[PDB]
Design a protein around this ligand. Structure first.
Ligand SMILES: *[C@@H](CS(C)(=O)=O)[C@H](Cc1ccc(CN)cc1)NC(=O)[C@H](COC)NC(=O)[C@H](CC(C)C)NC(=O)c1cnc(C)s1
Ligand SMILES: [Cl-]
Ligand SMILES: [Mg+2]
Ligand SMILES: [Mg+2]
Ligand SMILES: [Mg+2]
Ligand SMILES: [Mg+2]
Lengths: 244, 250, 231, 196, 226, 204, 241, 243
């Protein structure tokens, strides 16, 4: 019968690892680097686009940075199509919570839910896992600014600064070197771009290659603003920090 | 008499490759060249009508398809896979959008729905990926003109101009030299015909080329009068005669 | 070899190896004999023990007042099939006020066994059955194999060393068929038949199991001191 | 409604009035109640218009699919498919259908299917609200093996009386002739039949 | 409601009034009761207004997808068959009464559909509470081989009969003309015989007439930003 | 027994010159018993305003439902929903509960951000759209509101005149209905400013 | 090498099960041909009854799908009948739902979409058949549409299918290169059948008796197959000029 | 290689090897035949007497469908029974809806489509039987033979099982020597002869002859078994011809 052709995606190796999760992580290690840095007065999300072509319409393009609600955003590393399936689920979960409790969903609850979906694909159903790692940048009134990551295993953890995708080993060493707890958003912006500039496989870091975003509690009158940077604005912040 | 294939046929190999997606992309590479160019006042999509026999009536085989009145599609790769995607794309535009909001979806969201269908064939049980790359050109009120590419993975990217299939590497280089942000629609059609001539071996005329535009509203093609707001479809497939006219000024 | 992984696969010579392997489980099972005359039908079964502390595994199951079987092979599969027969016998009584014909009982077992041989995931039944009964056309004896093949016979035997009993019955055919209106002599012929399949062990009081059905005799099983008479 | 089907020497003729009413308002005065389920198998509809149309459409579908696989269906087969729908959905239907058809083997045949979903093969059949008024007339005047002209007159005179007495019936008398020769439609206007 | 449809020389024409009612009050004075299905197939609706609207929109959506699939102009019989099978399924609970008319490769067609799923074929039809007023006019004046000019006159006259004599019907007359080999012309507010007369007085108030307890500015924008 | 008249309340909307106005009373009751004098019936999703009369549990449920749907709309479309599109979304959502409907009388009001055109619409409980040029009424005193609007209204009123007209239409209608009143709110909506005014009215 | 057993991509981007289904097409060793007249569409096919014990009247690869549509199959008979029964069902369902007779090209598309599903879904195998649909469509006129195991379909001016399809195809190509029209300019279907048979004789280089051929003719509002005696009359007329 | 391990897999030839392996199970089985006569059909089968303990005339192999169709098969006997059970369901639902008993060509396609369906999926095994069947309907007599692939044709004479070549040769003589046709009573005699001649392939064990027939004149178009004197007359005719 059909048994013959079954890869068996949800089994342990003799060493106690999940084959498909490990291979999905290998897939993600080739994806464009995404960095999240959390400051006292905000969060930075920086990410490197993978497919440099001059003919790519950049201003209408979105492969890395997605909005989940007004308070929470994600940076993606891996298969974009897989990420979009999960993103739309997370967008619905946030609105279900808002409908039920009449309050914006706490960041960790949203993260756990997505992470639980990913976990399910590793334990049952016989389907391949999602080849996606997220960096979640968000704010709520309990814990304030939060950074998380999730990976295809469905394990998630909290961070002050973190990278996913390509050259994370190199990137995490550089962040660990220059990060400090009293840091501010403007400093974190500079750290994120400097880290990408050194770890990038490209010859030089330019505006047409980057997606960039900030979550600040520096909106008018103590609200939280999500800013997804336009191409010209990425070009300006590259000149300001002194990279181009 | 059971469907026992409830498990993924596309899986990660040790190197992190999704084999079936890569192989689907190889099938797209073998397919006939198609291209898309975006102008200031329009978009053009074009491909070669590679006729399998001269007895076959190549007019009956439509490689360039209307999805909505303001959105069109063209492909490279496996034709049958494309045909069923067009059927699903037309239907999803109604079920998940028009029947809710009373208007056709914008280009990016219809593309998103097609992408989703293609992604599901890359993860669901007992199916292979679609062996096509699509180029979807369209217009909507708030985004203006746009051109999208959709791959077997479900990934999609917006383009100013691009090409897919057989001679795409050479064609994309040709388009990089010629494209600028001040192109009129007629200039883009002219560039499309020049680019497409390089990848075509045999006959090069209106009968062997399929070409459509997303341009101005066509109230003449609407079929009715009496509603000022409905001004007619922006999608228009160029006739065999209309192509030949522009090939004289080539 | 390559074509024995499941029941759904024919071999290149047109064989179903999983069915043949199920057939093999019957040959490993303990011997049981069936025979009949025009008036009565008899089952005789050599029961098997695990060791001297254990009981002897029961071989004969009652299906209705006028029908029952003996088993050889996987006993849980006999339980499933006998339960199915009980239900079909019972359905015939409740709905039609009709005792189920033994020939029709065989047809039902055949079709139940067949479904397991043509579909994926399932396995063949690992048991052979000898069904006796007395219905509106007199005494009957059936042999069920889990391939699906059911066969109406005057006499037969299945299990280990069953060829000895089967040859005896083939010689005795003309004698035992005439044993009409004499249950004890028909059982004697069955006990003498099953004795041809014995080696080393002999028929003791808790070893032997006999059943009978006939004209004015409901299907009844004899075990223990009730079979000492025939030893 | 006044409907009838009558067997005769050369085949069968179906006849009907043309009035459809919603209470006392005549919703349609030129209704066609003679409806085709196959080339030479027709039916007369009475009861709920929605129900009889829904049934007739399904039967036409079944006989079309029968023909693609097994060739031309018998009139008996058509009547059976009508019956199966009417009987199995008797709780949700108000349909009184007469089925009439021409084979070359069986010649003219008429089957009536009243409310219950029973089938009755008959030499002729009458149905609809206006039929009550012509049981006496039709019984006295029907003969077997009539000619075409006699059967047309028998139906014309019959439905004329049904129309005269029943308010629910009226308009034109439509007829459909089913013979080896083919299918002929006839129509008869008030000025013709009223003066009979 | 007064809706009507009739055929002429090389076409079919539909007419409708523009009044929507809730019991005895007028909910809408300018509603479009001639629904769009395909470019050359139109549908007049009576009964429950939401139902007539929803069923025409649904069949119109499915007709569009069918037309794309088959690469053919949609036929009026397809709309007719789809509408009736839907309406029959719901057993009259979708209380829509429709006159369907159009042009296709087969020719010009005119049908009526009832809420329970029955259909009629006709040369002239009318539905709704004003059907009897309209049908009286159509029975008096309809003939074979009407010109387009005569057909528009008769259709609008039939609708007018409903407007004046039926309380359910009122306001303006909408028409749609579907002629063979030509674009269908949809003529909303074809007649306007019920414009309100100028008022005697202006009831515009002196400013400050209304007593106010509080005032505030509503923030409708996204993020007022730093 | 009739769900649309258990709780009571009213909404009225009007168009003016380059502006729209939508207004509502503040009462929530259990038939004769007045319960709340702060139950607002007008909500907004970006720049589109939705008034809802009828059964109060459905008013609250639908508000939460359209907030949900317009939030997702905005994330996917990357723009706020417009009044014309939202009207179609309300109609759709109501009609999908055709045979178990929400017992409500919704009213949409807003200005299209691109064309600048004032827009109002009303619905029955199963989603039939009434897209009026002049005014829309809804609630237990809808007859009273129809009478006031039909006489008081004139086209192309300036924002501060339109305020007076809609306020007097609401107040005098509410005072002839037992189940309406207990306070009132009026929104005056222009292309990029919205003023909200609470009215002084009799508290019986 | 399980990429060759089920319908998934090989490293070359190929579906081997689809390619092998195309090879099953020629297992019968029968050649078919279809051409269009002014008012008609004719389809001819070789008929081979090797066994004397066979009832030759039951040996057929031409099917009456609906009144208007005919279908000739190149491939094994079980798959041919599978396809025939489905097409009949689809044609009947279409008429019931949409109120008019299913067009030839729409049926072809529908069957091609079903064939596409077997190339994408693993549990279903492709049918090893090429389906040639013929009619006189009420909108498009004389019509030939052909479907294969890949799910590909297209309209044809004329077509040929089988082991010796290339010989028949080139023969037809050369005729239409001369005439410079998309059809056989002939009034009666009888002469269009005579053309079809003549050009198959020339292309294959074999003579035919009445029992060696099988003919289907589509006219306005009906498709029918010719009897052996109707074909004999056709063969007599060919020989006499 | 590996193309023969799973049902519904095309080999590079374009063949389904599992179906071809089911044919080997059919070729292994006992001989069965069918003869079309003037106004009906005759079915006959070879039943191997494995042992003296088999009760004569009891293990009946030929099966009736409805009241007018006979079915006989060679190969895996349970698979044949499963197919006839389905055939009975098909014949019942046809009669339920359309009133008339199922025509033989209609019935043939019902079995044909069902057998063909078991070559479409790897989750099922093909049928290990070739089935000879037929009867009398409104259009006269019909004889069919159905293979594991789902393939079936109409026949003048049909034969399958281990002695099929021998039988086929004998049937071919009858077709040549009787173009005007064969009577029902003649066909019974000839069927007995052909089974006796075909028994040379299974000559080790002795056998039991079983014959059935549908004929418009002899059985009123109903399926009946040949019994008693008519059976013995056919056995005597057959025994005389071999000697
Ligand atoms: C006339 C129908 S009549 C009097 O039965 O002949 C119109 C037809 C019509 C069709 C389409 C549209 C708009 N596309 C408008 C009007 N129908 C009506 O006036 C109907 C009432 O007829 C019985 N009006 C409604 O159905 C109203 C909705 C409009 C006011 C927008 N709804 C209701 O009255 C109710 C629905 N459910 C309730 C409970 S109350
Ligand atoms: Cl389809
Ligand atoms: Mg009368
Ligand atoms: Mg009050
Ligand atoms: Mg009070
Ligand atoms: Mg497959």
């Amino acid at each position: 019968g059909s048994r013959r052709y079954d890869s068996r995606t949800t089994i342990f190796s003799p060493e106690g690892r999940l084959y498909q999760v490990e291979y999905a992580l290998e897939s993600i290690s080739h994806a464009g680097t995404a960095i999240g840095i959390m400051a006292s007065d905000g969060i930075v999300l920086a990410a490197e686009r993978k497919v440099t072509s001059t003919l790519l319409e950049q201003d209408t393009s979105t492969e890395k940075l997605y909005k989940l609600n007004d308070k929470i955003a994600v940076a993606v590393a891996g298969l974009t199509a897989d990420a979009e399936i999960l993103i739309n689920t997370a967008r619905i979960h946030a609105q279900n919570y808002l409908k039920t409790y009449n309050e914006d969903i706490p960041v960790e609850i949203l993260v756990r839910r997505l992470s639980d979906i990913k976990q399910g694909y590793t334990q049952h159903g016989g389907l391949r896992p999602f080849g996606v790692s997220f960096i979640y940048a968000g704010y709520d009134d309990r814990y304030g600014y939060q950074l998380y990551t999730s990976n295809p295993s469905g394990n998630y953890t909290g961070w002050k600064a973190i990278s996913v995708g390509a050259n994370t080993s190199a990137a995490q060493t550089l962040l660990q070197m220059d990060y400090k707890d009293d840091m501010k958003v403007d400093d974190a912006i500079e750290l994120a771009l400097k880290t990408l500039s050194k770890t990038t496989d490209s010859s030089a870091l330019t505006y047409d290659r980057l997606e960039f975003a900030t979550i600040r509690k520096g909106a008018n009158d103590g609200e939280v603003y999500q800013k997804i940077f336009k191409p010209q604005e990425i070009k300006d912040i590259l000149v300001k920090t002194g990279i181009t | 008499m059971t469907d026992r294939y409830s498990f993924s046929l596309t899986t990660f190999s040790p190197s992190g490759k999704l084999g079936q997606i890569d192989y689907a992309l190889t099938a797209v590479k073998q397919g006939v060249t198609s291209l898309g160019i975006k102008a200031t006042n329009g978009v053009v999509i074009a491909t070669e009508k590679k006729s399998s026999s001269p007895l076959a009536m190549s007019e009956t085989l439509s490689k360039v398809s209307l999805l909505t009145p303001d959105i069109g599609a063209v492909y490279s790769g496996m034709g049958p896979d494309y045909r069923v995607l067009v059927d699903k794309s037309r239907k999803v535009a109604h079920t998940s959008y028009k029947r809710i909001y009373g208007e056709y979806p914008p280009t990016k969201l219809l593309v998103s729905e097609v992408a989703k269908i293609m992604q599901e064939a890359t993860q669901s049980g007992g199916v292979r990926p679609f062996g096509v790359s699509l180029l979807i050109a369209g217009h909507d009120e708030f985004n203006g003109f746009s051109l999208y590419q959709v791959d077997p993975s479900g990934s999609y990217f917006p383009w100013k101009a691009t090409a897919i299939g057989k001679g795409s590497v050479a064609a994309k280089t040709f388009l990089e030299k010629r494209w600028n942000d001040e192109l009129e629609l007629e200039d883009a059609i002219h560039i499309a015909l020049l680019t497409l001539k390089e990848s075509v071996e045999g006959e090069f005329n209106g009968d062997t080329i399929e070409l459509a535009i997303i341009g101005d509203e066509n109230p003449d093609l609407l079929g009715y009068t009496g509603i000022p707001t409905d001004k007619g479809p922006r999608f228009r497939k160029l006739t065999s005669q209309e192509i030949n006219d522009r090939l004289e000024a080539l | 070899n390559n074509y024995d992984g499941d029941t759904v696969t024919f071999s290149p010579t047109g064989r179903l190896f999983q069915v043949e392997y199920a057939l093999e489980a019957i040959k490993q099972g303990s011997v049981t004999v069936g025979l009949r005359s025009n008036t009565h039908a008899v089952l005789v079964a050599l029961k098997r023990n695990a060791d001297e502390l254990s009981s002897y595994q029961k071989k004969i199951i009652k299906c209705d007042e006028h029908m029952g079987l003996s088993l050889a092979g996987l006993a849980p599969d006999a339980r499933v099939l006998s339960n199915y027969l009980r239900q079909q016998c019972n359905y015939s009584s409740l709905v039609f006020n009709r005792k189920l014909a033994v020939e029709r009982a065989g047809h039902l077992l055949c079709d139940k066994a067949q479904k397991n041989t043509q579909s994926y995931g399932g396995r063949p039944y690992g048991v052979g059955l000898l069904i006796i009964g007395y219905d509106k056309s007199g005494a009957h004896l059936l042999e069920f194999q889990p391939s699906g093949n059911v066969t109406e016979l005057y006499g037969t035997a299945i299990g280990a060393r069953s060829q000895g009993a089967k040859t005896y019955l083939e010689r005795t055919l003309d004698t035992f068929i005439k044993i009409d209106g004499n249950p004890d002599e028909l059982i004697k012929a069955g006990v003498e038949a099953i004795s041809q399949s014995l080696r080393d062990e002999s028929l003791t009081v808790d070893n032997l199991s006999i059943a009978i059905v006939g004209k004015d005799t409901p299907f009844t099983i004899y075990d223990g001191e009730a079979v000492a008479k025939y030893i | 409604t006044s409907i009838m089907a009558v067997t005769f020497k050369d085949g069968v003729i179906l006849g009907a009035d043309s009035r459809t009413t919603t209470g006392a308002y005549i919703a349609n005065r030129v209704t066609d109640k003679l409806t085709r389920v196959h080339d030479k198998i027709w039916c007369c509809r009475s009861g709920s218009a929605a129900d009889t149309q829904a049934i007739a459409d399904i039967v036409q579908y079944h006989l079309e699919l029968y023909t693609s696989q097994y060739g031309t269906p018998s009139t008996e087969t058509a009547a059976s498919v009508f019956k199966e729908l009417c009987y199995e959905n008797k709780d949700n239907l108000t349909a009184g259908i007469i089925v009439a058809g021409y084979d070359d083997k069986n010649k003219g045949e008429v089957y009536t299917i009243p409310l219950g979903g029973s089938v009755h093969k008959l030499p002729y059949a009458i149905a609809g609200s206006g039929s009550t008024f012509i049981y006496g007339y039709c019984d006295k005047n029907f003969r077997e093996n009539m000619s075409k002209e006699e059967t047309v007159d028998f139906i014309k005179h019959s439905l004329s009386q049904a129309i005269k007495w029943d308010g629910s019936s009226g308009g034109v008398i439509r007829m459909v002739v089913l013979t080896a020769a083919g299918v002929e439609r006839l129509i008869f206007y008030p000025d013709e039949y009223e003066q009979l | 409601t007064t809706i009507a449809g009739l055929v002429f020389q090389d076409g079919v024409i539909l007419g409708a009034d523009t009044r929507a009612t809730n019991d005895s009050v007028v909910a809408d004075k300018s509603c479009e009761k001639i629904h769009f299905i395909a470019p050359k197939i139109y549908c007049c609706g009576a009964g429950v207004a939401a139902d007539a609207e929803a069923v025409t929109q649904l069949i119109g959506s499915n007709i569009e997808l069918h037309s794309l699939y088959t690469s053919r102009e949609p036929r009026v019989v397809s709309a007719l068959q789809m509408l009736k099978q839907h309406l029959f399924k719901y057993q009259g609970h979708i209380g829509a009464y429709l006159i369907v008319a159009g042009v296709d490769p087969t020719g010009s067609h005119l049908f009526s559909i009832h809420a329970h799923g029955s259909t009629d074929v006709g040369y002239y039809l009318s539905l709704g509470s004003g059907s009897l007023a309209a049908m009286a006019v159509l029975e008096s004046h309809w003939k074979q081989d009407l010109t387009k000019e005569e057909a528009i006159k008769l259709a609008s006259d039939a609708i007018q009969a409903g407007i004046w004599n039926d309380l359910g019907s009122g306001s303006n007359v909408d028409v749609c003309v579907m002629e063979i080999g030509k674009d269908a012309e949809y003529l909303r507010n074809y007649l306007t015989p019920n414009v309100r007369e100028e008022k005697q007085k202006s009831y515009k108030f002196p400013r400050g007439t209304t007593a106010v307890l509080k005032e505030s500015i509503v923030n409708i924008c996204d993020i007022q930003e730093e | 027994s009739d769900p649309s008249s258990i709780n009571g309340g009213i909404v009225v909307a009007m168009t003016g010159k380059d502006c729209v106005a939508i207004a509502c009373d503040l009462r929530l009751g259990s038939q004769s018993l007045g319960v709340s004098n702060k139950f607002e019936k007008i909500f907004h999703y970006g720049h589109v305003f939705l008034g809802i009369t009828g059964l109060a549990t459905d008013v609250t449920t639908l508000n939460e439902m359209f907030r949900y749907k317009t939030n997702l709309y905005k994330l996917k479309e990357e723009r706020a929903i417009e009044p014309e599109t939202f009207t179609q979304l309300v109609s759709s959502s109501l009609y999908e509960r055709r045979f178990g409907p929400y017992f409500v009388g919704p009213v949409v009001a807003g200005i299209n951000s691109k064309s600048g055109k004032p827009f109002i619409a009303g619905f029955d409980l199963i989603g039939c759209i009434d897209e009026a040029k002049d005014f829309i009424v809804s609630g237990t005193a809808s007859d009273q509101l129809f009478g006031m609007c039909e006489s008081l209204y004139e086209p192309n009123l300036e924002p501060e005149d339109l305020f007076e007209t809609i306020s007097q239409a609401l107040l005098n209608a509410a005072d002839r209905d037992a189940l309406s009143g207990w306070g009132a709110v009026v929104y005056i909506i222009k292309k990029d400013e919205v003023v909200k005014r609470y009215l002084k009215m009799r508290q019986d | 090498g399980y990429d060759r057993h089920i319908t998934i991509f090989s490293p070359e981007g190929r579906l081997y099960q689809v390619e092998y289904a195309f090879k099953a097409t020629n297992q019968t060793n029968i050649n078919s041909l279809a051409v269009r007249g002014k008012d008609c569409t004719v389809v001819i096919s070789q008929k081979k009854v090797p066994d004397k014990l066979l009832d030759p009247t039951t040996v057929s690869y031409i099917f009456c799908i609906s009144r208007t549509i005919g279908m000739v199959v190149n491939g094994p008979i079980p798959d041919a009948r599978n396809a025939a029964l489905r097409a009949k069902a689809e044609a009947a369902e279409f008429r019931y739902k949409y109120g008019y007779d299913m067009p030839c090209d729409v049926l072809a598309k529908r069957m091609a979409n079903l064939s596409q599903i077997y190339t994408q879904r693993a549990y279903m195998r492709p049918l090893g058949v090429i389906l040639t649909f013929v009619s006189v469509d009420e909108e498009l006129g004389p019509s030939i549409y052909k479907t294969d195991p890949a799910g590909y379909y297209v309209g044809y001016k004329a077509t040929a299918t089988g082991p010796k399809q290339q010989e028949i195809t080139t023969n037809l190509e050369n005729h239409f290169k001369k005439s410079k029209i998309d059809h056989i300019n002939e009034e009666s279907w009888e002469k269009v059948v005579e053309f079809a048979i003549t050009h198959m004789i020339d292309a294959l280089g074999t003579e035919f008796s009445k029992n060696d051929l099988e003919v289907g003719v589509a006219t306005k509002d009906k498709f029918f197959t010719l009897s052996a005696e109707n074909i004999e009359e056709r063969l007599v007329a060919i020989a006499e000029q | 290689t590996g193309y023969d391990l799973s049902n519904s897999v095309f080999s590079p030839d374009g063949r389904n090897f599992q179906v071809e392996y089911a044919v080997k199970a059919v070729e292994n089985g006992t001989t069965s035949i069918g003869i079309k006569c003037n106004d009906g059909v005759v079915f006959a089968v070879e039943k191997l007497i494995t042992s003296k303990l088999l009760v004569p005339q009891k293990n009946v192999k030929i099966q009736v469908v409805d009241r007018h169709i006979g079915c006989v098969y060679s190969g895996l006997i349970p698979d044949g029974r499963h197919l006839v059970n389905r055939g009975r369901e098909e014949a019942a639902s046809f009669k339920k809806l359309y009133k008339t008993p199922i025509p033989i060509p209609a019935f043939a396609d019902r079995l044909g489509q069902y057998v063909q369906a078991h070559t479409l999926y790897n989750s099922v095994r093909p049928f290990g039987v070739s089935t000879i069947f037929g009867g009398v309907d409104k259009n006269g007599a019909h004889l069919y033979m159905l293979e594991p692939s789902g393939s079936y044709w109409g026949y003048k004479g049909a034969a399958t099982g281990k002695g099929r070549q021998s039988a086929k040769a004998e049937l071919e003589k009858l077709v040549d020597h009787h173009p005007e046709g064969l009577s029902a009573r003649e066909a019974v005699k000839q069927a007995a002869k052909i089974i006796y001649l075909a028994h040379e392939d299974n000559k080790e064990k002795d056998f039991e002859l079983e014959i059935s027939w549908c004929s418009l004149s002899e059985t009123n178009g109903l399926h009946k078994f040949v019994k008693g004197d008519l059976l013995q007359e056919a056995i005597d005719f057959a025994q005389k011809e071999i000697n």
